[PDB]
Each structure stands twice: as C-alpha cells, then as structure tokens.
Amino acid sequence: YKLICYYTSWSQYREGDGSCFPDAIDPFLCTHVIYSFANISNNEIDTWEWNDVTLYDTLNTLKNRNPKLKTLLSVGGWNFGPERFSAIASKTQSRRTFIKSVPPFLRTHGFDGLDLAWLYPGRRDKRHLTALVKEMKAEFAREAQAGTERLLLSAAVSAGKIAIDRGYDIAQISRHLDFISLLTYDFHGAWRQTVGHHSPLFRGNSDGSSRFSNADYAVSYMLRLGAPANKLVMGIPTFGRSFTLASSKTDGGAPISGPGIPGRFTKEKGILAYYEICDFLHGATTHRFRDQQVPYATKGNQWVAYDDQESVKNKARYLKNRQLAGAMVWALDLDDFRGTFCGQNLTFPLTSAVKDVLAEV
Ligand SMILES: *[C@@H]1O[C@H](CO)[C@@H](O[C@H]2O[C@H](CO)[C@@H](O)[C@H](O)[C@H]2NC(C)=O)[C@H](O)[C@H]1NC(C)=O
C-alpha cells in the first residue's frame, strides 16, 4: 500500500511550533512525499519559494535514511490560476516547452517524479489535459532510455461528480498516470450558509440531493469511469474546516454567518490544522455523524468539521476493502508533526493511524 504525503512549501513561515521543515518528517512514515507547488515561468517548470533549492535538498536527504522513500514535486496548486495552466496546455508549442523542461529540473534536484496539481480544469480543458499527460509520460519514457529510473507522473484529481464529468477524461489519463489522488475532502459547500462536513465517508441517509458528495460515491464513480483500483489513492484530510455559527443551532443543518476564526499558527479563516484542533477540543463538545462516520466539534459560536484517529482509520479500512492503491494525506505539516499538541506523545498521530491500518494487513 502506498502512502502519499504532501508537504507544503509555505508551512515554514508559521510562527513558533507551527513552523515545519522537511527536516521534521519521519523518513519511514510515508512511501511518497510530494513537495507542494512549483511554478511554471517561460513555460518551464520553476521554483516558487526563494529557498526552495535548499528545502528540495533538505527533503531529498531523507532518502539517505530510507533508500526506498520516493519523492515528487507538484506543479500547480490553488494559488496557481487554472487559466495560466489552461493557456500552457492549449498551445502545443507552450505544452512541449514545459514538458521538455521537467526531467532536467527534476533530475537536478533529486525528485523521482512530477505530480500534476492543475486545480480543476474546465469543460474546455479535458481534451488538452489528456494531451498533457500523454506527452508528459511519453517524455519520461524517452528520458528513461538514458538508463535510469523512469520518473513518476501522478495527478491530484477532483472528487466531485460534476467536476469530474466536466474536465477529466479519466479512462484516458488513467493509463498514462502512475497513480491518481482523489481530493476526497472538499465536499461541503465552499459556497453556502449551512454547517456541513467537508469529508464524509458515506452518504448520510438524512439528506438526499448531493450523495455524490462523499468518499464512497467518488471512489465508486472513478472505478466506474474506468480508473483501475490499483491506481486510485483516496485523499484523507489532516485538517478540519471551521465555521462561525449564526445561531445557537448546532445540529446538522445549522445557519452560518461565515468561516471560522483563524488558528494561532495557521492564520487562515475557515481552516484549522489538526494540532490546532487538538487544543480547540478542550472545552469543546464532540459530536460524530454515524451515517458518514466523521466527527465535528463546537465551542462558543465556532463549529469545526474534522477528522480524528478513528475517523481516518475508518477511511483507511474502506480504501483497503475496495482494494485501492493506498491513501494520500493532506499535509504532513497540518498533522501533529511535533507530537506535542495532541496528548499522547505520538508524533504524526493521524498519518500514523492510516499507516497502522494500511500495514496491519
Ligand atoms: C509565477 O510565475 C509568474 C509568471 O511569470 C511569476 O509572476 C511574474 O508573473 C507575472 C504574470 O505573468 C509577470 O507579468 C511578472 O513579470 C512576474 N512578477 C514579478 C514580480 O516579476 C511569479 O513570480 C511566479 N511565482 C512566484 C511565487 O515567483
């Protein structure tokens, strides 16, 4: 079983304990670590943060301690406009230039592969996305002729029915990618006013429009669309999503005046790192949807939808029962990498839980 763990570039800037460097990563924890977000300049892959060269290096030494650990660099991201991605993929000229620029870059820094994080291609992008992956893999196959490990090519894909239908030629890109990571944790309406859990495992028999909004359906759909189970990786969030309640109503369906307040170290509205959540729980009321099998917490006018150890173990067992390729964690930097915020002196609580389930069989 594969355990793809993303590490985000900008997590170094977090104050105090929040600050996380490749340095703090357990070399034996995951099987693949993806460095989060590289840019594209002059239609050529390029760095993002000033000290990326240094961090790329910090991260790629972990392989000295664990020969088998494989690393990948991811292009795109949320702060990377799909428009610009879209423009690179439409002109066969821009596309080829970008492609040709990757292997050298990757080789130079020590990455064993590239991860496409084109965050959501539109209906007019499907055709080109397919082109992009085909040629990419083709270039990697050619470069491997030079007598060296072939680079890996993976992609972070949306897990919403509509999104998938709109911009992905799954059956096609499936045969060219090494593995696909399902963003199975962006399910609850980033758009509207009611409390809701962003990463439900099952359907939640109470509500009936939006079933397509859960891990199960997403995975089933992908398999139906033609993606081989041995290539699917279900994404598991290591963070929670926050909401500022608009009424004393807390139960499912409650009103929302807007996103929750920022975390001391995360400093971002609506989001909370798991270690921040561990501190939040103190004086908070824990609740859990049996239907979807995920928990949520409330304190004051703050409502938090998140994943805990069992929640994540539960998803891990799911993934296993459908015989998927493995799991993908959202950031390693959002988990308790210090192990000093969530009791139990364990480091990387969440990601470990997944590993335990993934390894006990
Ligand atoms: C992202 O790539 C862009 C593309 O060049 C870099 O942002 C630049 O992008 C603008 C949009 O095309 C250019 O017009 C500007 O010349 C340029 N910005 C500056 C200040 O020079 C960008 O720097 C890359 N991202 C990062 C984080 O460096």
Q: What is the CATH number of the domain that holds 299?
A: 3.10.50.10
Please name the residue whose Cα sits nearest to atom 26 of ligand 1: 48
CB of 79 closer than 6 angstroms to any ligand 1 atom: no
Method: X-ray
Burial of 285: CB neighbours in 10 Å, binned 0-12, 13-18, 19+: exposed
Q: What is the 3-state secondary structure (H, E, C) of 311-337?
A: HHHHHHHHHHHCCCCEEEECCCCCCCC
197 close to 187: Cβ distance less than 8 angstroms: yes
Q: Clarify whether residues 151 and 43 are in a common domain.
A: yes
Q: Left (φ > 0), alpha (ψ -120 to 50) or beta: where does 351 sit?
A: alpha
Residues 62, 44: Cα–Cα separation, whole Å: 27
3-state secondary structure of 268: coil
Rounded to 5°, angle at Cα 18 from 236 and 26: 55
Q: Clarify whether residues 68 and 129 are in a common domain.
A: yes
Q: Could you give the number of structural domains in the chain?
A: 2
What tokens were used for 80? 């990377």
CA of 102 to the centre of ligand 1 (A): 19
Please name the residue whose Cα sits nearest to atom 4 of ligand 1: 41
Q: Clarify whether residues 263 and 345 are in a common domain.
A: no
Q: Clarify whether residues 37 and 105 are in a common domain.
A: yes
Contacts of residue 297, Cβ cutoff 8 Å, sequence gap at least 6: 277, 280, 281, 284, 285, 286, 287, 303, 304, 306
Q: 300: domain range?
A: 239-306
Q: Clarify whether residues 163 and 283 are in a common domain.
A: no
128 close to 122: Cβ distance less than 8 angstroms: no
Residues 87, 77: Cα–Cα separation, whole Å: 15
Residues 76, 35: Cα–Cα separation, whole Å: 11
Angle, helices 349-359/309-321, rounded to nearest 10 degrees: 30
For a substitution probing ligand 1, which of 8, 9, 39, 55 has the most ligand atoms within 8 Å of its CB? 39
Contacts of residue 15, Cβ cutoff 8 Å, sequence gap at least 6: 264, 265
Please name the residue whose Cα sits nearest to atom 6 of ligand 1: 41
Given CA atoms 269, 270, 273, 279 in this order, what sign does their dihedral have? positive
Q: Which atom of ligand 1 is nearest to the CA of 39?
A: 1
265 close to 15: Cβ distance less than 8 angstroms: yes
The CATH number for 225's domain is 3.20.20.80
Distances in Å between the Cα of 225 and the Cα atoms of 173, 229, 285 are 11, 11, 40
136 close to 95: Cβ distance less than 8 angstroms: no
Resolution of this deposited model, Å: 2.9
Domain closes at, from 306, 328, 343: 306
What tokens were used for 148? 């060296």
